[PDB]
Design a protein around this nucleic acid. Structure first.
Lengths: 126, 150, 51, 139, 108, 52
RNA sequence: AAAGGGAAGCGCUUGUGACCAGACUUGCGCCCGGCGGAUCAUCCGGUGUUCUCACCGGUGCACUCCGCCGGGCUCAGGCCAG
RNA sequence: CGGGACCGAGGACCGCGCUCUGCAAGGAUGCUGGCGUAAUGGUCACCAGCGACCCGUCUUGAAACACGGACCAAGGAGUCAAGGUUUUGCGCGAGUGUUUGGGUGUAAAACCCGCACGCGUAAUGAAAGUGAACGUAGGUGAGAGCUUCGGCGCAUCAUCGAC
């Protein structure tokens, strides 16, 4: 069903924080690493460089962990797992675990349809 | 930019016990309610000493209690947020009403044989919720090997 | 008086007998001390390994 | 004595077998937990007086703790199956939760859980078909 | 435990004389003061003496059986006569025992 | 069940421990008449109105 | 598929092309009309409970309850805007 | 008295008030249109405007010099033991420590047992040796808390005494 009424969801930044020189080196993964060299341009925060993550980029406490529909994802593995969201159909959406078989997926989708609970990946294995 | 020559200071005091004792947690909840809802500074001091650690809670002996029971304190309820220990050097235990965190077996037996009463701190909070007619006692803090070696 | 506990037979039904509850069942329940002793005690059957 | 509902909550507030902890919230699998939330307000196995509602074949089934039989789990539950009109079920559940002082703070949650179960027991409607969008999905 | 160490957090950022052939058993002589002397009496019997139900009986205490060779004189004694058998005694201890009404006997 | 008391009496150097709390029912302790009859008036509610 | 007048690579922000995730599809409450049934109110007995609240069995005889379908009305509903 | 820009945090009522049938008074509502899908939004590639030295490492005050780096995968560097010291938690408490050993066992686990012993309970002196109450375990000034409102005074500090 439709989610509970909430304030508009604001992302202060949608771009990821890319690791320095991971664009130029394939052995460097793009996952963020804080530069620790004393003469690093990014760590010293010269303009025109990569931004560094900080707590000022934090999201609104009312809309944290919300998908764009306004729900919060809850991982479910079976029918007894998806029945835990009986009282939270306006706030929580079920998300079937990736290793759940197709038959159990049909059972979970049927039970969540009865309970009025949104399934984020209901089209899978069909 | 704001010129802050002085620095705002975070608290240098315990606001919660580091112990994981569930009964101590219940006692802390009870005395938090009492210290929030009463005038009495006794409840605030008792909540503080419940927060305190073991080196900050030295034991109190029956001989020390008997020393402080003199001169008009014979009817006051003795409150010690520590362990009450027994003293062999005290041959005659006077009649006393003592509330404590815990008693040793010999101290409890000798108090009850002398005819006094042993209480816990929740019983103390039930009977004297404002700490009326009470003698609050502490043990010797500096009587430690480390403090002597300081 | 101390509380009692009912005795059940091989048919699952009470036999009409009761036993006085032992005093160890009113001991304080201390999960921190249980965890400490369990952490210490669960290592006592360990065999040593080395290269 | 040495055992209380407060003590049981202090023992099992961090871990129990009913706990489901995830990033977006903590839930409970307890049968006596209304709204399936981990809190002292809703921990039915912790609380001395507690209510729980489960679905039946048609209607609801409400269990309540008996305070005189806490040490007798086989006869610890007062169970009523409501198979009638939804309004009568809500009235009986609200009376059972509020009229005699048996957890009046759980009245709204119990009526809500009964309504949710009775609404889930209704037949589902057929969904509208999925519309292909764009160019690669459409063609 | 290794997971609690600071190193896991710091990952990514790094007179007189000489005595030949001394035998301590020669100089073994543990001491007890008089204010712990009544603690050697068993508890029930001690409580009977301190209450005063035994007005015609005097307790005899052997310090060597309890592991003490010398009776020292720190503290005070009640007005109950006690017989003390000790290898050594101090002047104040014997004075306080005789004030209490007893006698210190010397043994070996 | 009968032998449990003798088992815990036969443990030398160990007694059944004394708790630091006599009454574990915090609700009864707080809402008892002895505590509630000497409390102050409440200085507020659980929810505080925003002033400005 | 694309770029390239003696380096590329990166940051902010548009644009173009390619490709996508959501959201939505209607819900709830009244007023009529048409069906299908009597787990409507009261009373009696039994049972259980929180000891005044419930369930079960007889009683409804259809202006009372519960479902379904046709119409009408109100309210709430998605995106961008004036 | 006009003209323009950006913003609408909160979420039953309470309050301060006013021009008082109500209000511009403790935070945006009302009306209307188009569309209901890639239209908004998002990801990738590329162009454009502006911005932007190649990383460690070393040196001193700092640069420069110097040294390492063709690329990728897997390893790869403050660990363990003994003995101290301070702090945290726990048990017992003038005591404390079962596990050298014995009993027992569902058998390297768990449970039980106690003599000795270790540390603490007394110090000082090279040693022979001696060995801690004048006093409600003292006086004075502070000192939380309590009080019958006269005072009693924890811990701790300064100071004069006593052993």
């Amino acid at each position: 069903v439709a989610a509970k009424k909430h304030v508009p969801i604001v992302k202060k930044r949608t771009k990821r924080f890319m690791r320095h020189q991971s664009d130029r080196f394939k052995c460097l993964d793009s996952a963020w690493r804080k530069p620790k060299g004393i003469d690093n341009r990014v760590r010293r925060r010269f303009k025109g460089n990569l931004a560094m993550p900080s707590i000022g980029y934090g999201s609104n406490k009312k809309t944290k962990h919300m998908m764009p529909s306004g729900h919060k994802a809850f991982l479910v593995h079976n029918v007894k797992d998806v029945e835990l969201l009986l009282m939270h159909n306006r706030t929580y959406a079920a998300e079937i675990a990736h290793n759940v078989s197709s038959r159990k997926r049909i059972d979970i989708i049927t039970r969540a349809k009865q309970l009025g609970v949104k399934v984020t990946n209901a089209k899978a294995k069909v | 930019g704001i010129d802050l020559r002085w620095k705002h200071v975070r608290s240098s005091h315990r606001k919660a016990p580091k112990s994981d004792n569930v009964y101590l947690k219940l006692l802390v909840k009870l005395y938090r309610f009492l210290a929030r809802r009463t005038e009495a500074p006794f409840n605030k001091v008792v909540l503080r000493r419940l927060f305190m650690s073991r080196i900050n809670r030295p034991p109190v002996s029956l001989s020390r209690i008997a020393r402080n029971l003199k001169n008009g304190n014979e009817k006051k309820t003795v409150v010690v947020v520590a362990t009450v220990t027994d003293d062999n050097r005290l041959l005659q235990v006077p009649k006393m009403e003592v509330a404590a965190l815990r008693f040793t077996a010999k101290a409890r037996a000798r108090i009850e044989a002398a005819g006094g009463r042993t209480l816990t701190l929740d019983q103390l909070a039930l009977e004297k919720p404002t700490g009326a007619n009470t003698l609050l006692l502490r043990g010797p803090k500096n009587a430690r090997e480390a403090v002597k070696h300081f | 008086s101390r509380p009692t506990v009912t005795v059940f037979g091989a048919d699952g039904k009470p036999t009409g007998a009761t036993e006085v509850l032992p005093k160890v069942f009113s001991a304080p329940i201390r999960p921190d001390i249980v965890k400490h002793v369990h952490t210490g005690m669960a290592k006592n059957k360990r065999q040593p390994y080395a290269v | 004595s040495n055992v209380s509902a407060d003590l049981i909550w202090e023992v099992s507030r961090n871990y129990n077998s009913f706990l489901v902890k995830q990033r977006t919230g903590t839930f409970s699998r307890d049968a006596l937990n209304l709204t399936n939330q981990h809190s002292r307000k809703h921990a039915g196995f912790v609380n001395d007086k507690a209510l729980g509602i489960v679905p039946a074949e048609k209607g609801v089934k409400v269990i309540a703790k008996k305070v005189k039989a806490a040490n007798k789990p086989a006869s610890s539950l007062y169970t009523v199956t409501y198979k009638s009109t939804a309004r009568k079920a809500y009235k009986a559940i609200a009376s059972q939760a509020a009229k005699h002082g048996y957890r009046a703070d759980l009245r709204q949650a119990a009526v809500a859980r009964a309504s949710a179960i009775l609404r889930s027991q209704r037949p589902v409607k057929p969904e509208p078909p999925k519309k292909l969008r764009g160019a690669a999905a459409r063609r | 435990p290794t997971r609690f160490s600071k190193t896991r957090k710091h990952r990514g950022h790094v007179v007189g004389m000489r005595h030949f052939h001394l035998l301590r058993n020669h100089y073994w002589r543990p001491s007890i003061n008089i204010d712990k002397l009544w603690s050697l009496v068993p508890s029930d019997v001690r409580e009977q003496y301190l209450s005063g139900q035994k007005k015609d009986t005097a307790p005899v205490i052997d310090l060597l059986s309890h592991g003490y060779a010398k009776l020292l004189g720190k503290g005070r004694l009640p007005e109950i006569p006690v017989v003390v058998r000790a290898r050594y005694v101090s002047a104040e201890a014997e004075r306080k025992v005789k004030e209490a009404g007893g006698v210190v006997e010397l043994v070996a | 069940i009968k032998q449990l008391d003798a088992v815990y009496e036969s443990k030398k150097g160990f007694f059944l421990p004394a708790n630091i709390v006599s009454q574990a029912d915090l609700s009864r302790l707080i809402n008892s008449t002895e505590i509630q009859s000497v409390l102050r008036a409440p200085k507020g509610e659980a929810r505080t109105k925003r002033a400005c």
